[PDB]
From Swiss-Prot, chain A:
It is a peripheral membrane protein. Part of the phycobilisome, a hemidiscoidal structure that is composed of two distinct substructures: a core complex and a number of rods radiating from the core. This protein is part of a conventional PBS rod (called CpcG-PBS) with on average 3 stacked phycocyanin hexamers (PC, CpcA and CpcB). Linker CpcG connects the PC stack to the thylakoid, the hexamers are linked by 1 copy of CpcC1, 1 copy of CpcC2 and the stack is terminated by a single copy of CpcD. Ferredoxin--NADP reductase (petH) is also part of the complex. This is Phycobilisome rod-core linker polypeptide CpcG. Belongs to the phycobilisome linker protein family. Its main location: membrane. GO terms for cellular component: phycobilisome; plasma membrane-derived thylakoid membrane. Rod-core linker protein required for attachment of rods with the core of the major allophycocyanins in phycobilisomes, plays a major role in light harvesting. Although able to transfer energy to both photosystems, this is predominantly a PSII antenna. Involved in state transitions. The chain holds residues 3 to 196 of 249 of the full protein. GO terms for biological process: photosynthesis. Keywords: Antenna complex, Membrane, Phycobilisome, Thylakoid.
Curated annotation (Swiss-Prot), chain B:
Keywords: Antenna complex, Membrane, Photosynthesis, Phycobilisome, Thylakoid. It comes from the Bacteria. It is a peripheral membrane protein. It is found in: Cellular thylakoid membrane. Residues 1-178 form the PBS-linker domain. This is Phycobilisome 32.1 kDa linker polypeptide, phycocyanin-associated, rod 1. It comes from Synechocystis sp. (strain ATCC 27184 / PCC 6803 / Kazusa). Pfam families: CpcD, PBS_linker_poly. One of its GO terms (biological process) is photosynthesis.
Swiss-Prot record, chains C, E, F:
It comes from the Bacteria. The keyword Transport applies. InterPro entries: Globin-like_sf, Phycobilisome_asu/bsu, Phycobilisome_asu/bsu_sf, Phycocyanin_a. One of its GO terms (biological process) is photosynthesis. This is C-phycocyanin alpha subunit.
From Swiss-Prot, chains D, G, H:
GO terms for cellular component: phycobilisome; plasma membrane-derived thylakoid membrane. One of its GO terms (biological process) is photosynthesis. It is found in: Cellular thylakoid membrane. This is C-phycocyanin beta subunit. The gene is cpcB. It is a peripheral membrane protein. Keywords: Antenna complex, Bile pigment, Chromophore, Electron transport, Membrane, Methylation, Photosynthesis, Phycobilisome, Thylakoid, Transport. It comes from Synechocystis sp. (strain ATCC 27184 / PCC 6803 / Kazusa).
Length: 194, 289, 162, 172, 162, 162, 172, 172
């Protein structure tokens, strides 16, 4: 079935920004720069930060790293590998509803917030119908992903800050921790202290 | 032989040609045909100006004072050959060209580079030229009386790597060794040193992706080490070489040439994306087992 | 291909892990099943001719127009009857493969993926093949684990068609 | 992609010239054929499913090797892929017919198609045979004189035939 | 190369769809327009020398400092006047293309995209070119659909420049 | 959770599939194992205090400096001995969980994920815990499938620490 | 998500306790039921298309307002979406039956489903009616005594019925 | 990838044939070795860290040029990669043992590995030497008569040895 239709909403990413490089421009981590080993570390760390927010040694995917380092795969392939990883499934899929999982995916992969509940609703059914991989591939193959990040750049949160303002929109790793009230209740938190 | 792909590979005209032999008691038209063939073969299909012709060597050939092989030898040792192919080239480039012109094939191994580089360095260009012409291989294929010609077809003594490398040196019929995209650069220095080969990209006109050439660094390896694991559920992997990428523009597009390894299940998406990049498929090759 | 052993390795590899007790238990489950699967495959293989012909007749009985109507998609002529018996033969043979592999892998890869496009393009009713699969289920003669596993694959095909 | 108009424009621009009076007259003649062009696209499109499935049936009848076990069109997934390829080529041929230029076909359907087929082991000559069958079915549908205003569509039918031939040549 | 025909196909192709009535209507819309466009292209082509010379002169009159200030970006010497007349010719020629193509495609591909960078890099004022395009609008003599379409392309360039 | 039943469903869910004979076979694998694991968990639990005490003493004996050297990370004082016996108790208790669950799931979730960071941050030697696990392997007195599954988990933790 | 085994472990870990003797014995009892549980999952799965299609038909007969023009299950997309939902819910019910725990059904299928139906205007009570029809069909299929080692499946059937009730209540 | 079962299935389907009695019998014999196969996988897995580290220590002892400054395994990241590569190979050998088919090892670990090492300057012959050491340690562990139901594992051990030998041969 075709994806349920929904309308956009006004967003920074939807309009021309007249951007000039500053300390608030997301760093472009691309393999098109022929990155040295240490510089490849930073690109890999950036990808872990973008997708996981933090990769403990348990979370890391050393074989995917080697393949990216060797040119076997593109950055987008590395990002897919992270999205397909055990850490991503366990942290962001299993601990959330399909609706919140979609939000995480849109935020992490496309670098923007969702338009509305209806966008979350429309995509929530994709895992069930096309399978988990089908959802990731749709987003990674989307014109929005490719136009912004292509094959060789680590995705990032887009147009978060506007010039001359003290603060931007909330970073997604603050706005969207890996789980929320639903899983918090199951764990029996918050803990009464004192 | 080469039949179905002959035309797109630029081989069909050579399939349609016979070796140019100078028979004993040859006629003058025979001598003219040899002279034309030798100039086209040995000088890599460069245009030859009347002022550049080797009139004396042509006279001696016409008179039977020198055989075909000795005429080839004279052309190869001439200031004309050296100006075209020696004075401006890395010696590995020179060796590539000598092999193409005088033996009609590409070098097989690094050992050939070692031999000819040392011979040039120790005894000079003339000595090196003689080694090609006095070689067993030259004798067996061309002998005294036949102009050298491209040996596309499989022969005794061949190696497969020779076949792929001929299309690094031969770039089509309406083309010369001095009018190719890589210009003066050695085509095979890296292939020989690493004993690797490259996917064959046929000549322009009959192949949209004819211009695909890899960069110095940051290339995609030939084979999919790691298999399908990084791609998730995938049946088989292919290496696609893509050229002429322009549409997004810089900095979204950095290098117009790119090779990607993609799964079978994304080939439809890949071709669609390539088209929208403006790019042209140069080659597709299975990358996994 | 969906089979216990390959799925166990596929999961562990996707997690970059050595095999652990979970995967060993998958292997023990396969071992518990495999002989019954192999025995069922042999039984269906030995009665393939009767099963396929019987199944094809079953369809013809339930859908008489298929043997009376003219058209490329029907079996009123010998050409059509041979296509139909061939097709039912495919369903049966690929089911035996599922019993050998211990999963729907063979059905998924060889027969099911794309079947809807084929039946739509050549105007073949899924209901015909469902009837043939029902006949095989009622006539293969299996029992116990062989029967259960065999019927799952037949019901798997039936469900894919409806 | 180009269409019949922008093809002329691009050639004119590369020489820095206005379209000559003769070039303009040729395009005006193209305009007068437009209704027939629109009819041909419409008739092919309206019969696309029959064109593909009939041609497919004919191809497999003549080349049973393709569909026997181990043949390139055996298994549902490969059969489905094969039928899809036929429909894709037909679709792009109609695109070329619509625009009056082969660029869409060359750039977006045939780009890397032969390479794909070799890499996959799809028998190219058999695809070309399938394309030829669609061509014959399509041209008969385009030339059908019933239920339409009568005229000479031979100029367009010849153009369409060339687009089919272009596709068949590319897969071999 | 935005034209009715290519956009219709690209849209359908992006959707993996055969052309349907919607694209056929787009074709009919193109056909309703084309002859007027070709006639407009013919008229402009025949009057090209006068339009370009008058356009350049109208610019010099409105911006007399251009013909009297020394500098690579001005038209004080014959070099600059030739650059200027050439540029205006480009606008006119590419506009006739848009009339032939039936869309802004030729302007977008050949002139508009990147014009901002050009004018900034070489210190050419967009107002100069606006003045020339207004002259061509007022002196091309077209009427009816030929005028409307031609003015739309002339206005399109004016908007890009302002 | 790495557990046969959880992963069977996780994989089927990830694939949007109904469960099939492949997953039923995984379940049979689980049932074959479960009683041995439950019996192993009981035996380990009943002997829990002795195993923990023995394991800590084993560590202290192999690494006497841990009971002699002042420092927050060492067991010279009662505080550190209590921490140590607590840590070892965690390993044993979570190991019994893996036997109940039939997979490394509990070890992964509760102990292994992040253990590298803990040991580095608090200057705790992985070799200390490896010694304690080897003691438990040597002294739990299990046999047959219970011994094998229990040793797989103890070795799994040993491998994680080395 | 939890299965029957990891549900108990998670509770013990949060308490810092080993499973008690009665907890281990309870899980031993579950294991003794394992074959029946596998049989019930196999039977529901084997009939999934029939359970959904029959339930859908009955629902639209009892509530014709759903399929009248303007009805929530009117138009092909909405009807297909409706059938898809019934199949998804049934599938997640089988998942819960397989693992012996409701978490997979609660976390993946039911969590937030009520609000989604409210947002879309899907009639939640009609869905629960459909789920109850699937429930009745499924339990009969599980309880059928033919072609299976006869025994008492009352406990598993009650467990399965509980899962269907959980789904029905989550949307109505 | 293929396991032992689907390797035979894949071959049969290409020929359009049912598995023969001998093919089914041979697979039955494989099933009878299943317990030994599982035991060997478990034993190698349980000793994986020791197999890798001990082999690496022996390699560097025998080949000090590797770990001299400027050597291929000098610097932490290169030493880490080297240890990683050893572990990757051992892991895929256990995968091949588990499935009873070399395809997983060949496609996911060995394909393209020689070329990578040549391109990087990794001494493939040294890698092979390290693989041999892992082989020796692993086979001894698999053959340990103690703590296991006594029986003949010679055939499985040969199959495992062949997987190691393929790995060593592949890296040059
Ligand atoms: C309530 C669910 C019904 C019921 C069930 C029931 N089943 C058994 C026993 C077995 N069922 C199986 C199942 C399978 N074997 C296979 O190979 C497959 C495919 C992979 C399946 C699904 C097995 C293995 C057994 C054990 C051996 C046997 O054949 O009995 C029982 C018997 C008691 C037990 O719990 O084992 C029961 C009761 N019986 C009914 O009457 C209900 C309608
Ligand atoms: C060769 C292609 C065949 C053929 C075609 C043909 N058609 C016309 C004329 C017209 N056809 C159309 C088409 C359409 N009108 C619509 O509304 C739509 C649907 C959206 C379509 C496709 C139209 C508008 C015309 C013009 C009006 C008319 O009624 O004729 C001609 C006549 C030439 C002309 O355009 O004047 C021809 C030749 N005729 C044949 O004999 C071939 C089999
Ligand atoms: C060569 C590999 C060595 C060897 C192996 C061997 N094992 C068995 C039998 C069994 N091994 C197992 C294994 C496990 N049971 C579990 O629960 C787990 C933990 C998850 C494992 C790894 C089992 C179940 C059996 C069957 C029952 C039994 O206890 O024996 C045999 C006997 C042959 C058989 O196939 O049953 C053999 C030969 N034996 C040696 O001497 C080699 C050193
Ligand atoms: C002009 C008359 C008034 C004015 C405008 C103004 N707007 C912004 C910033 C934004 N405007 C938008 C608008 C949209 N986003 C969408 O998606 C759509 C539909 C496509 C619209 C119309 C957005 C998202 C922004 C923020 C992003 C961006 O500015 O690039 C500003 C800038 C605010 C700032 O702090 O920089 C201004 C100045 N301001 C006035 O004073 C006028 C009354
Ligand atoms: C250790 C015994 C020897 C050694 C190893 C070594 N390898 C590399 C680099 C790479 N190793 C691999 C291998 C794999 N990657 C995969 O994904 C898989 C398949 C699943 C394998 C087998 C790859 C791809 C690389 C390159 C990318 C990467 O850096 O990971 C190095 C590093 C060399 C460098 O830094 O460039 C080393 C040191 N080296 C020795 O000297 C030992 C004999
Ligand atoms: C036969 C099982 C299949 C087959 C073969 C086939 N090959 C060619 C052409 C060539 N084969 C080679 C191979 C080699 N050249 C070498 O130097 C070496 C090692 C020394 C090898 C293995 C080459 C180079 C060619 C082309 C040059 C030549 O043939 O002289 C063809 C003909 C190709 C054509 O006619 O265009 C064929 C048919 N084809 C099949 O379909 C079989 C599956
Ligand atoms: C003249 C209208 C334009 C032009 C031409 C130009 N061409 C070259 C060089 C070559 N032309 C060819 C073409 C062929 N050689 C063949 O054998 C065939 C038939 C099969 C063709 C079509 C080749 C191969 C060359 C290179 C060989 C050589 O000796 O040059 C040049 C020379 C360039 C230079 O010397 O650097 C030129 C000038 N140049 C223009 O400006 C005109 C538009
Ligand atoms: C010496 C200071 C260092 C060194 C050198 C070294 N070089 C090679 C091999 C080659 N060197 C060349 C060089 C040239 N070819 C040319 O055409 C020219 C210009 C005219 C030059 C300078 C080439 C092509 C080769 C390859 C063929 C050959 O081997 O001779 C080697 C051998 C490498 C091998 O693996 O065999 C060496 C040793 N090596 C050092 O360690 C020094 C720092
Ligand atoms: C100007 C002196 C000459 C000239 C230039 C020219 N270049 C292009 C197109 C591209 N140029 C690049 C360049 C780069 N990519 C990189 O990553 C870097 C290094 C960091 C560079 C320098 C690229 C990628 C393109 C293609 C994408 C794009 O167009 O932006 C063109 C246009 C090509 C076209 O066919 O449209 C031109 C004109 N051309 C000349 O004639 C001058 C000699
Ligand atoms: C039998 C129940 C009824 C019937 C059958 C019938 N089928 C076809 C044609 C095809 N059948 C298939 C099916 C498969 N091909 C495969 O590769 C596999 C998976 C391994 C399957 C299941 C296909 C693809 C076709 C079309 C191509 C081909 O013929 O091989 C026909 C002929 C249809 C036509 O138009 O030619 C018929 C007659 N027809 C009845 O009436 C029976 C009740
Ligand atoms: C049918 C007449 C013949 C046939 C076809 C066949 N093709 C494939 C696979 C692919 N076909 C394509 C072609 C395209 N994909 C596109 O998106 C486009 C438009 C740009 C084209 C032209 C591609 C890319 C594939 C591979 C990707 C995919 O998903 O299929 C197959 C399947 C091969 C296989 O499964 O291994 C088949 C069978 N086969 C025949 O025998 C006929 C001659
Ligand atoms: C059928 C008995 C009833 C019915 C259903 C119906 N549902 C929708 C739309 C959606 N249903 C869902 C369902 C889920 N989201 C999840 O995350 C899960 C778990 C995997 C489920 C089951 C979703 C997300 C949608 C919206 C997205 C989409 O439908 O693709 C519709 C269509 C609504 C519309 O406006 O098109 C319908 C019709 N409707 C009835 O009347 C029946 C009572
Ligand atoms: C000294 C404080 C204590 C100590 C040291 C010790 N180290 C090893 C072995 C290795 N040390 C390293 C370290 C490095 N290799 C590098 O390339 C770099 C970065 C440039 C570092 C820091 C490595 C990699 C090894 C292992 C491989 C090798 O042998 O080189 C040993 C031997 C360990 C073994 O098992 O052989 C020892 C003894 N030991 C003490 O007791 C000291 C207090």
């Amino acid at each position: 079935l075709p994806l349920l239709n929904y309308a956009p909403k006004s967003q920074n990413v939807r309009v021309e920004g007249y951007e000039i490089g500053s300390e608030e421009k997301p760093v472009v981590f691309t393999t098109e720069n022929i990155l040295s080993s240490s510089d490849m570390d930073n690109l890999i760390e950036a990808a872990y930060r973008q997708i996981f927010f933090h990769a403990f040694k348990w979370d890391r995917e050393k074989v995917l790293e080697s393949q990216l380092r060797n040119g076997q795969i593109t950055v987008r392939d590395f990002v897919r590998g992270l999205l397909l990883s055990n850490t991503f499934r366990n942290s962001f899929y299993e601990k959330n509803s399909n609706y919140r999982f979609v939000e995480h995916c849109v935020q992490k992969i496309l670098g923007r917030d969702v338009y509305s509940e209806r966008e979350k609703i429309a995509w929530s059914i994709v895992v069930a119908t096309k399978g988990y991989q089908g959802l990731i591939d749709d987003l990674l193959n989307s014109d929005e992903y490719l136009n912004n990040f292509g094959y060789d750049t680590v995705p990032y949160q887009r147009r978060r800050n506007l010039p001359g303002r003290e603060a931007g929109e909330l970073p997604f790793n603050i706005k969207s921790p890996r789980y929320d009230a639903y899983h918090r209740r199951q764990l029996g938190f918050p803990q009464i202290v004192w | 032989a080469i039949t179905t792909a002959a035309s797109r590979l630029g081989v069909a005209p050579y399939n349609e040609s016979r070796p140019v032999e100078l028979r004993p008691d040859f006629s003058l038209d025979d001598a003219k045909m040899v002279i034309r063939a030798v100039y086209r073969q040995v000088l890599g299909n460069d245009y030859i100006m009347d002022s550049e012709r080797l009139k004396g060597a042509e006279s001696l050939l016409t008179n039977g004072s020198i055989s075909v092989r000795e005429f080839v030898r004279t052309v190869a040792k001439s200031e004309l050959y050296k100006k075209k192919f020696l004075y401006n080239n890395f010696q590995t480039r020179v060796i590539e060209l000598n092999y193409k012109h005088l033996l009609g094939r590409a070098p097989f191994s690094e050992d050939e580079v070692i031999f000819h580089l040392d011979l040039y360095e120790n005894q000079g260009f003339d000595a090196d030229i003689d080694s090609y012409i006095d070689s067993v291989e030259y004798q067996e294929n061309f002998g005294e009386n036949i102009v050298p010609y491209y040996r596309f077809n499989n022969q005794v003594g061949d190696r497969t790597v020779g076949f792929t490398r001929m299309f690094r040196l031969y770039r089509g019929y309406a083309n010369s060794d001095r009018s190719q995209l890589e210009r003066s650069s050695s085509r095979l220095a890296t292939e020989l040193g690493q004993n690797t080969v490259s996917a064959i990209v046929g000549p322009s006109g009959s192949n949209a992706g004819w211009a695909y050439r890899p960069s110095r660094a940051g290339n995609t390896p030939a084979k999919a080490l790691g298999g399908t694991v990084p791609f998730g559920q995938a049946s088989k992997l292919f290496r696609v070489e893509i050229t002429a990428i322009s549409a997004p523009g810089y900095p979204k597009v950095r290098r117009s040439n790119k090779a990607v390894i993609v799964p079978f299940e994304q080939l439809n998406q890949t071709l669609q994306q390539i088209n929208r990049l403006g790019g042209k498929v140069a080659s597709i090759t299975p990358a996994s087992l | 291909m969906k089979t216990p052993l390959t799925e166990a390795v596929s999961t562990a590899d996707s997690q970059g892990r050595f095999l652990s007790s979970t995967e060993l238990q998958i292997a023990f489950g396969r071992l518990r099943q495999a002989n019954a699967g192999l025995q069922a495959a042999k039984a269906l293989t030995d009665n393939a001719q009767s099963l396929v012909n019987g199944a094809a007749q079953a369809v013809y009985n339930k859908f008489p127009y298929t043997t009376q109507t003219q058209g490329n998609n029907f079996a009123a002529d010998q050409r059509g009857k041979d296509k139909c018996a061939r097709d039912i033969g495919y369903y049966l043979r690929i089911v035996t493969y599922c019993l050998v592999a211990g999963g729907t892998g063979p059905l998924d890869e060889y027969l099911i993926a794309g079947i809807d496009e084929i039946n739509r393009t050549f105007d073949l009713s899924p209901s015909w093949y469902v009837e043939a699969l029902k006949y095989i289920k009622a006539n293969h003669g299996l029992s116990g684990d062989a029967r259960d596993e065999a019927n799952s694959y037949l019901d798997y095909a039936i469900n894919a068609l409806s | 992609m180009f269409d019949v108009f922008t093809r002329v424009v691009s050639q004119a621009d590369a020489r820095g010239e206005y379209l000559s009076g003769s070039q303009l007259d040729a395009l005006s003649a193209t305009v007068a054929e437009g209704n027939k062009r629109i009819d041909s696209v419409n008739r092919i499109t309206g019969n696309a499913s029959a064109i593909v499935s009939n041609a497919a049936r004919a191809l497999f009848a003549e080349q049973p090797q393709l569909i026997q076990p181990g043949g390139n069109a055996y298994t549902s997934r490969r059969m489905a892929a094969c039928l899809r390829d036929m429909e894709i080529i037909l679709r792009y041929v109609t695109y070329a017919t619509f625009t009056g230029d082969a660029s869409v076909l060359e750039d977006r359907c045939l780009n890397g198609l032969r390479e794909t087929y070799v890499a996959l082991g799809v028998p190219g000559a058999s695809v070309a045979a399938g394309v030829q069958k669609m061509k014959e079915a399509a041209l008969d549908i385009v030339n059908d004189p019933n239920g339409i205003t009568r005229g000479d569509c031979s100029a367009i039918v010849a153009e369409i035939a060339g687009y089919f031939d272009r596709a068949a040549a590319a897969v071999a």
